[PDB]
Coordinates of C-alpha atoms in Angstrom, one line a residue:
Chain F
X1 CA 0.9 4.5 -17.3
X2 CA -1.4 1.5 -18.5
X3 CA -0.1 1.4 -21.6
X4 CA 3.3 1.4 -20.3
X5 CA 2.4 -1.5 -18.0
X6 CA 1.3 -3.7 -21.2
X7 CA 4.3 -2.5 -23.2
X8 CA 6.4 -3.5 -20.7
X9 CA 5.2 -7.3 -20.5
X10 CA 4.4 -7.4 -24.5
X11 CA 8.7 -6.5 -24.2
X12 CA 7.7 -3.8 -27.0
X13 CA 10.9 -1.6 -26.8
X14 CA 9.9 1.2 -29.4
X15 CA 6.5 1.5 -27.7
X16 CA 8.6 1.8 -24.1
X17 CA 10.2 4.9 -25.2
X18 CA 7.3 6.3 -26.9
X19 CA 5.3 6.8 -24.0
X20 CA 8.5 7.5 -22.2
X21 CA 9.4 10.2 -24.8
X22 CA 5.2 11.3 -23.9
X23 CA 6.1 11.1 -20.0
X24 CA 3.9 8.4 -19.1
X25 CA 4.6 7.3 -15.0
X26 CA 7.7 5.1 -14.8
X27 CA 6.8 3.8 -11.6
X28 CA 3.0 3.1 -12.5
X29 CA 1.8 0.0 -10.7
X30 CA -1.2 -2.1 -11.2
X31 CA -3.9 -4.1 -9.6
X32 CA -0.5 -6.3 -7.6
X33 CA 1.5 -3.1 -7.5
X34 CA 3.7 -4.4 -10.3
X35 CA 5.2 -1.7 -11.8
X36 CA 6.5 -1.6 -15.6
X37 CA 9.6 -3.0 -13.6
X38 CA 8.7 -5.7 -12.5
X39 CA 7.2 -6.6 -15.5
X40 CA 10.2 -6.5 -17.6
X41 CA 11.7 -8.6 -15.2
X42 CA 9.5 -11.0 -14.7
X43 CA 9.2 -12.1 -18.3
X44 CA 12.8 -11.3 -19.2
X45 CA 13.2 -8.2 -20.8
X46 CA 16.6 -7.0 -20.9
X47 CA 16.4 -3.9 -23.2
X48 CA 13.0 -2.7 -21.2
X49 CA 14.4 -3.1 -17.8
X50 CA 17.6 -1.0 -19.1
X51 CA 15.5 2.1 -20.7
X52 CA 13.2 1.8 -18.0
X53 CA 15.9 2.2 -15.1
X54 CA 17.4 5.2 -17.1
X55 CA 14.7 7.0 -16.9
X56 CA 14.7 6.9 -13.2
X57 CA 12.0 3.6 -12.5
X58 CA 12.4 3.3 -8.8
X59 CA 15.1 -0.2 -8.8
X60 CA 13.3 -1.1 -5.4
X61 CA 9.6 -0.7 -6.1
X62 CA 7.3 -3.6 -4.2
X63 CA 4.1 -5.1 -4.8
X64 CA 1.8 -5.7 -2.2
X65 CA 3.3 -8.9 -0.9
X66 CA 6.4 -7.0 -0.4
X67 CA 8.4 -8.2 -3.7
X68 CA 10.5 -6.0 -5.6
X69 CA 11.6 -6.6 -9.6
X70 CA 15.5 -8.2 -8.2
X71 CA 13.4 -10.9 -6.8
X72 CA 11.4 -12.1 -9.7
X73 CA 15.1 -11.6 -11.8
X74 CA 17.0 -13.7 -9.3
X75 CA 13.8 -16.5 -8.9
X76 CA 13.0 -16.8 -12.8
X77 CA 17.0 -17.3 -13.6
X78 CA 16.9 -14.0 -16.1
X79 CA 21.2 -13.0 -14.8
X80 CA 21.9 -10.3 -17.3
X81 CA 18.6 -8.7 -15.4
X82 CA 19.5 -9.2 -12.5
X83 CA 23.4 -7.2 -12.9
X84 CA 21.7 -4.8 -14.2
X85 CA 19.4 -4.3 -11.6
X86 CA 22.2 -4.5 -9.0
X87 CA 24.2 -2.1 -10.6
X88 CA 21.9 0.5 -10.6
X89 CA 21.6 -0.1 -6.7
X90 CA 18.8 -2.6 -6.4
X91 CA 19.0 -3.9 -2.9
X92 CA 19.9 -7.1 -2.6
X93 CA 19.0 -8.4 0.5
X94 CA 15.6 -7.2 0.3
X95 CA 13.1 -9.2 1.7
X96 CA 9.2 -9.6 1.2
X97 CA 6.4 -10.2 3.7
X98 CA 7.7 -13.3 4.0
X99 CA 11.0 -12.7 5.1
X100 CA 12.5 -14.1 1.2
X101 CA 15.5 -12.3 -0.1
X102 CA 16.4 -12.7 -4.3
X103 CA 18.9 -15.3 -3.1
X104 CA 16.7 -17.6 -1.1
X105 CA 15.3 -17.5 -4.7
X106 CA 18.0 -17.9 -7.1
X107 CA 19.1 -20.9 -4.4
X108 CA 15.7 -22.8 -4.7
X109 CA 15.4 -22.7 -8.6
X110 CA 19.1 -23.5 -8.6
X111 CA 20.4 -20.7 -10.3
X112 CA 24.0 -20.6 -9.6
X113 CA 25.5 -17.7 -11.6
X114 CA 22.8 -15.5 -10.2
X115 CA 23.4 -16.9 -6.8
X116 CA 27.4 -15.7 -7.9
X117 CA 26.4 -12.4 -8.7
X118 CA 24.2 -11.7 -5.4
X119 CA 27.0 -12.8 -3.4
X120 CA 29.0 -10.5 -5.3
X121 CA 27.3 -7.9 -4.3
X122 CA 26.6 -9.1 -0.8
X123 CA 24.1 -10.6 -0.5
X124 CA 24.0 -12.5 3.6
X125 CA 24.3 -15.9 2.8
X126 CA 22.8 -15.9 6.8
X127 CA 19.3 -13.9 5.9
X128 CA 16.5 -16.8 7.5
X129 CA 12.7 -16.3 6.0
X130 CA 9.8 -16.6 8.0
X131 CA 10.5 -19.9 8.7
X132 CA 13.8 -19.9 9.7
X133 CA 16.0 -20.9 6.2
X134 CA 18.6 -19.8 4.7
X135 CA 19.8 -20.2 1.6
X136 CA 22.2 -23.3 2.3
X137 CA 19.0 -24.4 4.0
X138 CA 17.5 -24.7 0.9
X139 CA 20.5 -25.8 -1.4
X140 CA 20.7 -28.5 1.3
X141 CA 16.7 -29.6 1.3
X142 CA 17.5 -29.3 -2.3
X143 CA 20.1 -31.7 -2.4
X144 CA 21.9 -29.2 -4.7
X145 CA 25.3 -30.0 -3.9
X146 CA 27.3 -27.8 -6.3
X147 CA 24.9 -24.8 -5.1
X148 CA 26.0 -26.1 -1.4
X149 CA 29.5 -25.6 -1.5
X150 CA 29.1 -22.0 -3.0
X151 CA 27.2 -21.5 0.1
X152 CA 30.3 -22.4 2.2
Chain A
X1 CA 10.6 -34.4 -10.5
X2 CA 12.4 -37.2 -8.9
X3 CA 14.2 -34.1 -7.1
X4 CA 10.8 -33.0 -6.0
X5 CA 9.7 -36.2 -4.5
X6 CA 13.3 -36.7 -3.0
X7 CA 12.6 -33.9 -0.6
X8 CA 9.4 -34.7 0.1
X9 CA 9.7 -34.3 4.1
X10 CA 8.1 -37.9 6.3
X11 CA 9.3 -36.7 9.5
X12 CA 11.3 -34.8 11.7
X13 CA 13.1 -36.2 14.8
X14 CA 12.9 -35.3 18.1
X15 CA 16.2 -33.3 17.5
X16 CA 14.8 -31.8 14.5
X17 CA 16.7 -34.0 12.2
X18 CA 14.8 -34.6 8.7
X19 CA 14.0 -37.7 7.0
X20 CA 13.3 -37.2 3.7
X21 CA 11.8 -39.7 1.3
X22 CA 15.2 -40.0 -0.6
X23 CA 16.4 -41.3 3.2
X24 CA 14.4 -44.6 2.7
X25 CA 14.2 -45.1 -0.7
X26 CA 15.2 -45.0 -4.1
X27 CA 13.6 -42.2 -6.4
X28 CA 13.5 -42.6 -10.2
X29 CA 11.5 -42.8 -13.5
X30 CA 10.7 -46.4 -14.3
X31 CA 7.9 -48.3 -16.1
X32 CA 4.8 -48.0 -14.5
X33 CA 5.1 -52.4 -15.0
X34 CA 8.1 -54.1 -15.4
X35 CA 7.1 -57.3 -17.4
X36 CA 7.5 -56.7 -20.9
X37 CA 10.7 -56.3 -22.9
X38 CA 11.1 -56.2 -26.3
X39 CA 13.9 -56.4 -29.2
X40 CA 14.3 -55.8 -32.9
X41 CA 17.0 -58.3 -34.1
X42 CA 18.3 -58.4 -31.1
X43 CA 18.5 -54.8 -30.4
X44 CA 16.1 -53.3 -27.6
X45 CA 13.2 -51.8 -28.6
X46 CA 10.0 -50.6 -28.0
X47 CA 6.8 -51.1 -30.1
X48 CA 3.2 -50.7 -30.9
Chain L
X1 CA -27.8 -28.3 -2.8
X2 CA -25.8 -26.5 0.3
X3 CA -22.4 -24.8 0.0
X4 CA -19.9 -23.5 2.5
X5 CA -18.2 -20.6 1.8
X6 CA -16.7 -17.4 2.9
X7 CA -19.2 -14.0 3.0
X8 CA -17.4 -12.4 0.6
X9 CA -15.8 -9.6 2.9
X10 CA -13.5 -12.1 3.7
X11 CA -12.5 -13.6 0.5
X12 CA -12.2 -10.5 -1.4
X13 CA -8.1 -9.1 -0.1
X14 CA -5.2 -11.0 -0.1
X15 CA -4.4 -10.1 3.8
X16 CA -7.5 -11.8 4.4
X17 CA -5.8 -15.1 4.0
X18 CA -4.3 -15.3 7.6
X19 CA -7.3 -14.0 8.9
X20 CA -8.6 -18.0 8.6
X21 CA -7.6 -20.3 11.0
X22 CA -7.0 -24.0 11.7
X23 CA -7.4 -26.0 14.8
X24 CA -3.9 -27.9 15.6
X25 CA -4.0 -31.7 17.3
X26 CA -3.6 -29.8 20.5
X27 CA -6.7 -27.7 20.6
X28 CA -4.6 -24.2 19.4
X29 CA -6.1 -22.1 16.6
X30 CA -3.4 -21.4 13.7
X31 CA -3.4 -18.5 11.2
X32 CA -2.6 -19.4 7.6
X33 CA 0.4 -16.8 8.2
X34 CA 1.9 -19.0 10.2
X35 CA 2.7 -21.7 8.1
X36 CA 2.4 -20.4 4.7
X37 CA 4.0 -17.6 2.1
X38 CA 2.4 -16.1 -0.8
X39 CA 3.1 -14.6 -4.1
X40 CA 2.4 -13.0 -7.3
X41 CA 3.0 -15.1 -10.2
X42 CA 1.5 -15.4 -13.9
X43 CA -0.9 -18.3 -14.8
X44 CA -3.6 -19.3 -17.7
X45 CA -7.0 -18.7 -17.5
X46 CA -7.8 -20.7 -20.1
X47 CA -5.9 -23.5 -21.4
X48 CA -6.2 -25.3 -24.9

């Protein structure tokens, strides 16, 4: 499982299916509860986060602030990522402890064809965080215009 | 960013309206002094 | 010299975050969950 964990985030796709091929936990999760998911995500590998997700990784695993592998996709602009995630049923209006859904992330960083996609799987444009935003909120605040009317 | 300090929030009215920093003034790079100007042949230019 | 600091049981867990609070202009205490979010992220240890 730790190995797995490092060969996810080194993006080391033979050594992925090694240990997979040896059975090593899919969903193992480390000190943050990041799983070998959320790792591929995170620093944008595509082929890991494929293998990974066919050999049954949990698509909604959280850490321990409530964050699951479709927000780190959506928020670090990786879109192939975060299709595939979707289409193997990653929710997409989940939320972590602070109320944040994968499009209140793609919205801040700006990322409109990820924004796209997570509306085109229905994502609610309406979903407020803690404090109350939305995502037009934040194109707004933003003064991202282009992301503003795709909001509307 | 400019972007960044755009948004960067001074107040918010009584009918919680924002004002921004963009909403009173302009935001861009520019020399940290103004005063000197230089050209090659005419040309501008920068220099050491 | 003297330090302030937090005993360590109370620095050690991220939930312990909201368990500080802050005194607002009008005398209320405020947990750090109330006007804050958190995350995990990557970052250097050590830059060169």
């Amino acid at each position: 499982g730790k190995k797995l964990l490092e060969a996810a985030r080194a993006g080391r796709d033979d050594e992925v299916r090694i240990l997979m091929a040896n059975g090593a936990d899919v969903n193992a999760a480390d000190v943050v509860g990041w799983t070998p998911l959320h790792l591929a995500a995170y620093w944008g590998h595509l082929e890991i986060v494929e293998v990974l997700l066919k050999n049954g990784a949990d698509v909604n695993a959280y850490d321990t602030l409530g964050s699951t592998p479709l927000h780190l996709a959506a928020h670090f602009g990786h879109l192939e990522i975060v299709e595939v995630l979707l289409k193997n049923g990653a929710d997409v209006n989940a939320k972590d402890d602070n109320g944040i859904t994968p499009l209140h992330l793609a919205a801040n960083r700006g990322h409109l064809e990820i924004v796209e996609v997570l509306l085109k799987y229905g994502a609610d444009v309406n979903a407020q965080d803690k404090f109350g935003k939305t995502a037009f909120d934040i194109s707004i605040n933003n003064g991202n215009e282009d992301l503003a009317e795709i909001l509307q | 960013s400019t972007e960044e300090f755009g948004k960067i929030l001074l107040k918010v009215n009584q009918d919680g309206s924002r004002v921004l920093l963009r909403d009173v003034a302009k935001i861009e790079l520019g020399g940290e002094n103004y005063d000197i100007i230089a050209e090659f042949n005419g040309q501008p230019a920068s220099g050491l | 010299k003297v330090y302030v600091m937090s005993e360590a049981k109370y620095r050690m867990l991220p939930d312990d975050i909201g368990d500080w609070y802050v005194r607002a202009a009008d005398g209320q205490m405020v947990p750090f969950s109330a006007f804050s979010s958190s995350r995990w992220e990557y970052g250097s240890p050590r830059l060169e």
